[PDB]
Symmetry: D2
Subunit: 265 residues, 4 copies
């Protein structure tokens, strides 16, 4: 009886299906894959990347940036929703290949630095190349790049360091408040009496409320399907996109269902 | 004109006056200096150290451990109230010289790893040797060593990673609920509109309430004066020590006055 | 066509075949798998582990330690030949589950801390959970545990941080000088004009000489086949083992052939 | 009673700000009168080799501004060795600029612990820790614009001590600049040092390495070691040592120290 072979983080093909840049607002573009969000915000003072998707997505991201007129040197900042392999995957490589520095909260920083290992729920099941944060941010802290202001909103649950980022762009000669809210799922998590996360339920409850109150004209999520985006649909990608309020409400209802099932017995 | 010389974190003499171990309960001892707390909890499964004081206290702590019958190998765990120089100072050296591993929350861990540099309020004024945390703890998480159970209570404010640790020891044939609550001070802090700590006020207010509600037969604090301990007085050191409620009340009062003067 | 799926570090079944502790000398035991070395060296003051094999080997190592009378508290030190996945794999987990601290040279420490990512030759193909070194060692430095003294001998090549560890144990009332020499292979490596490792050839050449000159009654290697050990043969496991000289000479030959092939190509 | 914490107090000249002093077409001394901090500026970004003391961060930034180098323009930080008097402001510079650090493994580990647990100084000279972004190997090259930097390991003063070499121009001719690290062993236990068993061997190799460097112009982290006088402006390098003279002087001093140690 040999030990099991290691398994890589294999995923649905659509998570790895490359797409051309899709314009969300005047300065904001979806540059990831059909089923994983990676947002490029272009400012007069360099570019900002929010999430990168999977580890093998680095070169694709760089190719899309080039199409947008962004050189590796132009990329100044990487922000993250949470430090799982399907969102922070290519961060280490992007840091080696670009001028980009990472800003994240302490919880996301520590998970990123250990490459997603010793996950509270997944253990070492979903690892990726580790990276160091260049700046630690606090809840409500702002970062300004080229007159565009990004605000962090902590929403602990999916991971302890789960974060929503908000900024104001423009579209059709009008300000548009963009909310990139993190995942609110608890996929296979032990919810009550979890020794690794004693206040998990309380944190999720606060996070549902936080997501509801976000400045949110346009909502996007790390997994686009969670906010009902269809990136493959092009110009009508966000035709049926959920609001922050509807997103949180659906998430809490799922959560409540899971909590009920767990209580038996 | 030459740039100013660097300035060291210079402290009151009493913070640097060694003392012999002072018994708090059957397994819990104050082993730091007269004016800085360092708590040794001795179990049949090894020893736990809560805070180490200043960087220069490492050898003294080891002297006191040996006096208590705890070898460098016997020290298993280091816990921290917060990662300032006056409490986490000797952690790196203790890690090199003992079997000890550090458990801390993410905020304390990142501050520890940068040796207290780029402090939200103090800049680089209070640096110390950096150290890596061996285990990251979440709010309410328990750590059991030799049948003694330590519980973490996050109380953000003084630092983002400020933590209270509680455990039950025995004294006089009865259980004693010990609370090692962190500093609730905001010394010279900008409280409102602080870009480095936007929700400082909310965190402090939650922390006052957390401390007030702690399981707390005996309160100890990293700076013993904050809870009215006098370690140099020996047997009557904690005779007039504050309750957790009194400690939080005084802290909130001081905070409220500071906030009023700022607005 | 989507981006390629991630590929796991899959290995020969024999690398993952657990074995019971095999005694090498009075205080030195092989406790890994049939085809990956993990050495337990015991003293009255605690135990040392030299290498752990693959990431999935953690629980097996702990079980074998238990069988040898080494509790998690008794494991004091982890040393490494080199920080590849097939030798440092379970180090992070062992640190979490035991009192063990890691001592390694700066090169090995930096590779361990990035979990084998950005490997000079393998890129991100062989990643594992990252870990921090607790102590940095210099060439020729000794570490004493109980009455046993371990000496580091730097032998850069296979990795920049490649190290041989030597100590003296006993067998049949007599001292036995054990040499745990690191790998001297260059599997698929670009040898000449490698921008990531300009002095690769020079380092290997000095390393062949270093291995040749080690205090060496008993040679052991991270991959037992390299020193002609057969861990499945029990009492006769080391009956056909190579000397340090023979091991270095064969490795230099192989290397010379590889260099000639590269030069021709 | 226990002693107070120590601050790294230094000679006034080490903290004496100076305006940028041109060494060659791309290369400027931008530190203080008695601590080297070299700025190399290209159309594809600037490189800083050493920063001096921790309190020098704002001064370096002011001098960069004077040279037309914005915080965003600063791409790379290289180090001679990771002591407080050279890597001091690195953490702050990383926070305030786009700069990333390239260093060898030895320098990276020392930098990450802010100079603490020094092989010889213990915790006597500490500074704010920083992480390296790129690990370099011996002989590795880094290209920024038209400038090519080559690393030459010269272990001794610290395990990670490195010389950096590049070719600039001066009056229509190539000038091979060698920024050689310290070859001093101040108060060091040389023989039988358990923390550095092969110290003597490494130093002797390092003297030879420095002697052989491509070296039209030598600069050193402590400029006095190579007989530079930065305060003298246009005359600063008029009596600068060759790489050979620098290495020879260092070896003679080292030999003297070893003799004294063996005798005592
Ligand atoms: Mg026992
Ligand atoms: Mg002068
Ligand atoms: Zn996730
Ligand atoms: Zn995900
Ligand atoms: Zn404090
Ligand atoms: Zn304090
Ligand atoms: Zn290998
Ligand atoms: Zn291997
Ligand atoms: Zn040029
Ligand atoms: Zn120095
Ligand atoms: Zn110096």
């Amino acid at each position: 009886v040999p030990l099991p072979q290691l398994r890589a983080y294999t995923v649905d093909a659509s998570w790895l299906q490359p797409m051309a840049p899709l314009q969300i607002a005047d300065h904001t573009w979806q540059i990831g894959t059909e089923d994983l969000t990676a947002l490029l915000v272009q400012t007069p003072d360099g570019a900002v990347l929010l999430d990168g998707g999977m580890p093998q997505m680095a070169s694709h991201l760089l190719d899309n940036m080039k199409a947008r007129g962004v050189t590796p040197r132009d990329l100044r900042l990487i922000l993250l929703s949470h430090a799982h392999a399907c969102h922070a995957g290519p961060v280490a490589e992007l840091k080696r290949r670009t001028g980009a520095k990472v800003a994240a909260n302490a919880e996301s920083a520590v998970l990123l630095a250990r490459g997603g290992s010793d996950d509270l729920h997944f253990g070492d099941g979903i690892t990726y190349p580790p990276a160091n944060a260049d700046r630690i941010v606090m809840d409500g802290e702002v970062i300004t790049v080229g007159g565009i202001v990004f605000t962090a909103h902590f929403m602990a649950g999916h991971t302890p360091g789960s974060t929503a980022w908000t900024w104001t762009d423009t579209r059709n000669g009008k300000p548009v408040r963009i909310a990139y809210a993190d995942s609110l799922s608890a996929p296979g998590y032990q919810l009550q009496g979890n020794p690794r996360y004693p206040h998990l339920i309380e944190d999720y409850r606060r996070s549902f409320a936080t997501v509801r109150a976000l400045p949110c004209d346009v909502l996007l999520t790390p997994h686009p399907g969670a906010s009902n985006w269809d990136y493959a649909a092009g110009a009508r990608a966000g035709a049926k996109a959920l609001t922050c309020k509807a997103y949180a409400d659906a998430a809490e209802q799922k959560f409540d269902g899971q909590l009920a099932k767990e209580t038996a017995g």
